[PDB]
Amino acid sequence: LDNGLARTPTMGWLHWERFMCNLDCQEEPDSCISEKLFMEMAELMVSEGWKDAGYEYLCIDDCWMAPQRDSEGRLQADPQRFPHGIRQLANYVHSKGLKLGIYADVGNKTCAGFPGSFGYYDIDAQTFADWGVDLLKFDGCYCDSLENLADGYKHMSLALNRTGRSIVYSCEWPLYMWPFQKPNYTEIRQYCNHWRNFADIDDSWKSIKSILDWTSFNQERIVDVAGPGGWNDPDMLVIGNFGLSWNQQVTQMALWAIMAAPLFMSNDLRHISPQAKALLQDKDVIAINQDPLGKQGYQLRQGDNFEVWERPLSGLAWAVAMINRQEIGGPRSYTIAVASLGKGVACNPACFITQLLPVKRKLGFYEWTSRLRSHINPTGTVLLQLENTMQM
Amino acid sequence: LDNGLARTPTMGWLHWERFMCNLDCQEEPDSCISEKLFMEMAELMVSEGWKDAGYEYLCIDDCWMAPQRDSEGRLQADPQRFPHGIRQLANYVHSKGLKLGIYADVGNKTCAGFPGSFGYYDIDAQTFADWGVDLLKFDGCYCDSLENLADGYKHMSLALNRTGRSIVYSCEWPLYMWPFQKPNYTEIRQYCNHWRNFADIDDSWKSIKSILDWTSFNQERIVDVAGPGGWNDPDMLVIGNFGLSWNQQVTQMALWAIMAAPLFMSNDLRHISPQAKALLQDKDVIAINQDPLGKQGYQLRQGDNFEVWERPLSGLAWAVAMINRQEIGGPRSYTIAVASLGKGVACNPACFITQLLPVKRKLGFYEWTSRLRSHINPTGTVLLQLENTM
Ligand SMILES: *[C@@H]1O[C@H](CO)[C@@H](O[C@@H]2O[C@H](CO)[C@@H](O[C@@H]3O[C@H](CO)[C@@H](O)[C@H](O[C@H]4O[C@H](CO)[C@@H](O)[C@H](O)[C@@H]4O)[C@@H]3O)[C@H](O)[C@H]2NC(C)=O)[C@H](O)[C@H]1NC(C)=O
Ligand SMILES: *[C@@H]1O[C@H](CO)[C@@H](O[C@@H]2O[C@H](CO)[C@@H](O[C@@H]3O[C@H](CO)[C@@H](O)[C@H](O)[C@@H]3O)[C@H](O)[C@H]2NC(C)=O)[C@H](O)[C@H]1NC(C)=O
Ligand SMILES: *[C@@H]1O[C@H](CO)[C@@H](O[C@@H]2O[C@H](CO)[C@@H](O[C@@H]3O[C@H](CO)[C@@H](O)[C@H](O)[C@@H]3O)[C@H](O)[C@H]2NC(C)=O)[C@H](O)[C@H]1NC(C)=O
Ligand SMILES: *[C@@H]1O[C@H](CO)[C@@H](O[C@@H]2O[C@H](CO)[C@@H](O)[C@H](O)[C@H]2NC(C)=O)[C@H](O)[C@H]1NC(C)=O
Ligand SMILES: *[C@@H]1O[C@H](CO)[C@@H](O[C@@H]2O[C@H](CO)[C@@H](O)[C@H](O)[C@H]2NC(C)=O)[C@H](O)[C@H]1NC(C)=O
Ligand SMILES: *[C@@H]1O[C@H](CO)[C@@H](O)[C@H](O)[C@H]1NC(C)=O
Ligand SMILES: *[C@]12O[C@H]1[C@H](CO)[C@H](O)[C@H](O)[C@H]2O
Ligand SMILES: *[C@]12O[C@H]1[C@H](CO)[C@H](O)[C@H](O)[C@H]2O
């Protein structure tokens, strides 16, 4: 989408995976979808270093809405959970230096059963623009055939444009297309700043594996269409929650950087370990994700429960990820000719290799003819940065 | 097995899950199956508080054997990897006040392809006894019939007894039978100090869940036969490795305690987090696992992606574990009438409840009329101890 936005993958926080559709503010107030939750998340994004690290968008997912539209046909914030309305939350979020994302659905109802945009594409787009909304996530539930899905996604895109406000547009067009026919990524890219391809993540290693395996299986179809203004969206970062071991968390961060994924944390910023925080705020891995070249990486090799992924970076640098998919035993040795990495460019005539994950370690100069030898934890990833050099 | 051993479930360390069949001492001397690995783990069991917490058996699994028996038909330690031999390793382990476990297979080979014990049960038993072995784990691979399987496990049982040496006998008889016919657990217990029921654990939450699901499904057949001298073995603790989140590690420790499971760590004691160490050394939770009554706990309830398990303890105490099996979202609220716990006796007329996991916290006095409310982490467990007020 040529709206001048998302020149790098969008970074922020989204409530869905962690907080879901919790409407019970009486018995579950700390986890219910309320203005107070977003106000508190906003403060902590500023004070706990998240905005500094690049996480800029505070995003509302499903279950912010009143059950019905107002008399004047507009969407309304839930009066009990959002009594001060979207406009004033937008003011609060802007006052902290952050941008505000909101959520709607192309079809008749949102996935959670709240008012769809089946008509109203134009008034809804305008409502968001009046409110101060800086990002829209547009889910695809309750949609009447391919024709409407496509038409709806294309309509809301132009509608947001016609508001003349800068609004990052986040689509699930491809994901809700698969059931009928293969997506057309060139068309989707025209209309959308990023697009969900695959089933909602949850707080599990199984979910990470299934997203990586779908991505690598399908990589010839999706890798090249990604670039500034249009990204593949493999769903939210779930680091800092309950389901992933330290190693599986390193794997998600490493490979979301390889895939030029948007980085939407879905966690509780009020209750997050120092380890998870340091990983999500790792300047060097964020720098790989945010690389201005904006070329998505890919899986180079698979075999013996090992995966090798790499991503081209600006200035003849490469990121390399080595995954151990063996879920038994100890750290496994993996060796590769440095020549085989970065299409033989990265280390011609030399590489300087820095390990970034699981810890940051200068490894030194590798000749084009060198071997790289590493040890990789089960369900973990080693992430390397290769800097092309004349020296040595 | 009435040999006076395993009166509480056996505690220690077993190489298999973390170190497996690593024979590469040239390229990997610090993780190959060698007497140096076992000596290192022994020193740390003493120096790092493992022994003091009750971890007492340092156990060798598969891949310790030379490829061939000796000229006298006996098993031999690999001459390169176990150069001083098993007896001498046993001497060392004993000098630190620990016990040594070793491994054999009821069939013609071990699962990894080394010499099997079929036809050598009596000599193999005497060999182990002579060496000063304090425990045998007896795997079930390369056994052509259920007759040979049963005969082999019983025969080794009687041969161990006849050596005169106190040797804990860990069997896999039910595991290898189950595909073909329902095991008789009354018979297995007469011959075995503990018995593997289910597929080898690995370093995953999938493995944990599948072991718990198998145990809850089969609980009518296995819970009542467990007790001092004979335990269900749901396989090794993998806490301190790579594959489990903190909440999944808590779930393993909590439910191995509810299940009166043997506690065999398979980890690297040289490289283990403070968190993993304090969970595995948690004295209140080990006291539940090690309760002298020896009554295995069971699944009370399952619904809304929650499980409630409980175990009766010495002195009118109960352990209760509440699992959140929902792998999405945040800490979920669960409430149960305390009258529904411990068969109606735990909290009649009242009980004092202490949370043990994920943190120790006194919750206070609960009346027979009361409801316990808890928030449980996705893939996590809340473990409570109930003390009846009388
Ligand atoms: C509604 O849709 C229209 C139709 O596309 C859209 O207009 C386009 O906006 C983009 C973004 O501003 C324009 O692209 C820019 O063009 C100008 C002029 O050539 C350049 O200054 C811009 O350069 C930036 O990006 C460069 C990297 O590519 C940087 O090097 C540089 O520093 C600049 O930051 C950029 O190329 C595009 O020209 C228009 N196209 C048309 C047909 O007008 C409009 O923005 C949409 N409006 C909203 C609010 O959605
Ligand atoms: C070989 O098999 C026999 C028979 O099963 C085992 O005998 C049993 O041994 C236990 C433990 O020594 C006896 O019970 C215990 O006795 C001791 C001392 O008297 C007491 O302190 C305990 O409280 C408990 O009562 C058990 O009764 C006995 N059974 C029989 C029939 O004699 C023997 O231990 C086995 N030997 C080896 C080397 O495994
Ligand atoms: C370990 O290996 C030996 C040798 O391969 C096994 O011994 C063999 O066991 C088979 C049973 O599977 C015997 O075959 C039987 O032969 C009779 C007729 O003789 C036939 O009627 C049966 O139906 C069956 O086919 C075979 O005779 C026997 N061979 C020897 C040398 O004893 C042994 O059983 C293996 N042990 C285990 C536990 O797997
Ligand atoms: C997939 O979508 C792309 C973009 O809509 C299609 O390519 C364009 O099709 C339009 C309308 O037919 C042409 O006017 C353009 O010249 C085409 N290219 C571009 C880059 O805009 C493409 O035909 C669609 N279908 C397939 C099978 O690729
Ligand atoms: C399961 O195995 C047990 C023990 O081998 C069997 O129980 C024995 O039954 C015999 C009768 O054949 C009695 O002599 C013994 O007193 C019992 N032993 C014990 C300690 O109970 C039982 O028969 C087997 N059950 C089935 C269903 O086959
Ligand atoms: C919404 O429902 C109406 C019928 O009430 C139907 O005509 C329309 O196709 C539906 N719209 C979408 C986008 O599914
Ligand atoms: C749409 O299953 C829905 C849900 C909201 O109800 C989330 O937004 C999810 O990410 C999306 O795929
Ligand atoms: C038998 O798969 C084997 C293996 C040794 O080779 C381990 O001892 C495992 O625990 C056991 O079931």
Name its key features.
binds 2-acetamido-2-deoxy-beta-D-glucopyranose, pharmaceutical (chain B), 392 residues, Immunoglobulin-like, Glyco_hydro_27 (chain B), 6-stranded antiparallel beta sheet, 8-stranded parallel beta sheet, binds a molecule of 3 linked components (NAG-NAG-BMA), hydrolase (chain B), TIM Barrel, lipid metabolism (chain B), 12 helices, binds a molecule of 2 linked components (NAG-NAG)
Order of helices and strands of chain A: EHHHEHEHEHEHEHHEHEHHEEEEEEEE
* Strands of chain A, total number: 16
Strand content of chain A: 15-25%
> What is the end-to-end distance of chain A?
43 Å
CATH homologous superfamily identity of the largest domain in chain A = Aldolase class I
Number of domains of chain A: 2
Biggest beta sheet summary of chain A: 8 strands, parallel
Q: What structural category do the secondary elements of chain A indicate?
A: alpha/beta
Family (chain B): Belongs to the glycosyl hydrolase 27 family.
Subunit structure (chain B): Homodimer.
Protein name (chain B): Alpha-galactosidase A
GO molecular function (chain B): alpha-galactosidase activity; catalytic activity; hydrolase activity; protein homodimerization activity; signaling receptor binding
